[PDB]
Design a binder for this molecule. Structure first.
Ligand SMILES: *[C@@H]1O[C@H](CO)[C@@H](O)[C@H](O)[C@H]1NC(C)=O
Ligand SMILES: *[C@@H]1O[C@H](CO)[C@@H](O)[C@H](O)[C@H]1NC(C)=O
Ligand SMILES: [Cl-]
Ligand SMILES: [Cl-]
Ligand SMILES: [Cl-]
Ligand SMILES: [Cl-]
Ligand code: NA
Ligand code: NA
Ligand code: NA
Ligand code: NA
Lengths: 355, 355
């Protein structure tokens, strides 16, 4: 009933500490649909901060204590009531143990404590799954939440290419990026960049990319000058050059965006300046989605949705996320919308927001 | 949420008493799948017996008191937990008001009290649905239980032809016949044919066909001599010449078959002769399904299944009916069986039978 853990067979490809990376799998032999989900969980952008992460959030840097099984939730649930359209898919959860926003593509240097291999983890999972049924797939949906969402944007075209090169051109590779669409904006009030809470988005990725030896998609890399590849971690910059179809799910007021912007909305009264900052951030997010054909962007203050059990409950313009996703799937193959962006100005202006 | 009643616009096509026939409809604009379900409810084969039926089961002869709405159940449910694969289909329930096993194709004669138009009801429903979305369909599944099941066998190729003639050759017409697969066998002990309870199966249909002016499929009609069209109401005789794919669901020990065979199994001890009769009936039913590629035939004493809420619960050889149906749908488009026939000798030898 649960997804079962498999540790990768390729010993070169590891979590930060060198323990084997892996994936959880629940096979569904009556379906040709595969859902490959990339876990989120922030990042670390220097050795001091990765050392702290290792001490406090070891599961995000090591496979040593991963459980043998995981129950799928939300889009990974095999229960029809929880996942009405896609419950019968082949379900894969790839734990995030690379701290690199799934962008690392090099073996560890002798001058590093940690290895940053997230892009290679994805590649190796895909290769091992080919011997487990993925060879027969019709659709491979690379999905992800938060850092995993950004990971989808960074890896979907790599995966697409990989399957073609390996001899499986009929598998349709698509992406689903949830809560991974950020603005490289100015903080409301500044804090010096010392950790992931205090570091403005541009600065965090400029530092991170270098530390991780992170790679970005080739089609986006071209658009920016040498040393300016950090741009490609920002959805509105990377999205227009993608080859693969990607559906974008994004809360207009994402809690992680607010955190790195040094805004904390807790149900307190706010001053006009903060009001304006927050309203403008929602407008800016809307602006970036105007030409994204397949999107779901409710006016709520939240973070992540697709593996949450109550992902069926939020609606935009009268339509749920699972339905919008189904409509998109059909469009890629009347009364079935795929572009669903709220336009009201403040979080919870949509009555269906999670509470 | 419910299916809503529509009375047919074609005034020539009526229930037994001349009231308008009709259909219940729940549209699902995000699906190209249509389920058209034919209700069962025995038959009447002369005026005396139809008069009694009118007095005691008027709903089966008249639309006068039909409710404005009906909740879909089983395969007609829009609830994922109840109908895991096909909950999102366009749902149509066609009430049985013709008492003719859906075989009547003539206007009423002035020498009759009742009109027998069941084949024409189906045709007229299909024509009216074309203006309601069916024009866009990918799959039209003509399904039915008991008399409706036999109705599927009698009408599926007519429907197929009809859609082609009307200019919609891309719609894939298929059938699902539940509890409509009977043997034209000898009664265990004889009773004179005076009503539907006492009349042996051959005699019932020989009488009925004539009374109804019933029509049978052309491909089967050819196989039998003039006046021997009654043969075509028996699945094992009509099935081999069908053009359309038909999935057959049949309890090995169908309660209606036993009734017309003058057997009543109620959990009492039975004599060896009755034991042998019942065992042979199961063997015979098995024999008739050996070359039916898509079938689900559990060793249970029951009648009907596909619109029952607990249709998900019975299993044969480890597989449920909704799954077998999904596997068949995929086959028509490994680890996905479609031919599922029990081989044990007595009802309830399958532990999953309904209780
Ligand atoms: C092992 O992983 C590395 C990096 O992803 C890759 O280049 C190599 O092809 C893999 N080896 C095998 C045998 O799959
Ligand atoms: C009315 O129904 C009759 C019998 O089914 C049929 O022959 C005729 O074509 C129908 N008329 C219309 C206008 O659909
Ligand atoms: Cl299945
Ligand atoms: Cl390091
Ligand atoms: Cl839909
Ligand atoms: Cl009559
Ligand atoms: Na902050
Ligand atoms: Na709006
Ligand atoms: Na009887
Ligand atoms: Na068996």
């Amino acid at each position: 009933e649960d997804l079962r853990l498999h540790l990768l067979l390729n010993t070169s490809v590891t979590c930060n500490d060198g323990s084997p990376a892996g994936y959880y799998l629940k096979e569904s032999r009556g379906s040709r649909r595969w859902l490959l989900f990339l876990e989120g969980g922030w990042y670390c952008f220097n050795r001091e901060n990765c050392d702290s992460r290792y001490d406090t959030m070891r599961r995000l840097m090591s496979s040593r204590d991963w459980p043998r099984t995981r129950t799928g939730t939300g889009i990974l649930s095999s229960q029809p009531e929880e996942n009405p359209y896609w419950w019968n898919a082949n379900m894969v959860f790839i734990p995030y143990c690379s701290s690199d926003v799934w962008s690392g593509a090099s073996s560890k240097s002798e001058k590093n404590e940690y290895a940053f291999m997230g892009a290679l983890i994805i590649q190796e999972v895909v290769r091992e799954l080919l011997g487990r049924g993925l060879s027969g797939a019709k659709v491979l949906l690379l999905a992800g939440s938060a850092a995993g969402g950004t990971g989808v944007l960074l890896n979907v075209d790599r995966v697409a290419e990989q399957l073609e090169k390996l001899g499986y051109p009929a598998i349709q590779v698509r992406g689903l990026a949830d809560s991974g669409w950020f603005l490289d904006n100015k903080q409301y009030r500044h804090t010096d960049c010392v950790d992931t809470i205090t570091c403005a988005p541009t600065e965090a990725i400029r530092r991170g990319i270098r530390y991780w030896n992170g790679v970005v998609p080739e089609r986006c890399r071209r658009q920016f000058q040498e040393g300016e590849e950090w741009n490609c971690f920002f959805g509105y910059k990377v999205y227009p050059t993608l080859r693969s179809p990607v559906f974008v799910v994004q809360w207009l007021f994402d809690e992680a965006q607010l955190t790195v912007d040094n805004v904390h909305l807790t149900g307190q009264p706010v001053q006009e300046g903060l009001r304006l900052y927050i309203q403008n951030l929602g407008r800016e997010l809307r602006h970036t989605l105007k030409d994204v054909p397949a999107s779901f962007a409710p006016a709520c203050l939240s973070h992540e949705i697709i593996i949450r059990s109550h992902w069926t409950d939020v609606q935009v313009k009268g339509t749920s996320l699972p339905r919008a996703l189904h409509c998109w799937d059909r469009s890629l193959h009347k009364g079935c919308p795929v572009h669903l962006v709220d336009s009201c100005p403040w979080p919870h202006c949509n009555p269906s927001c999670p509470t």
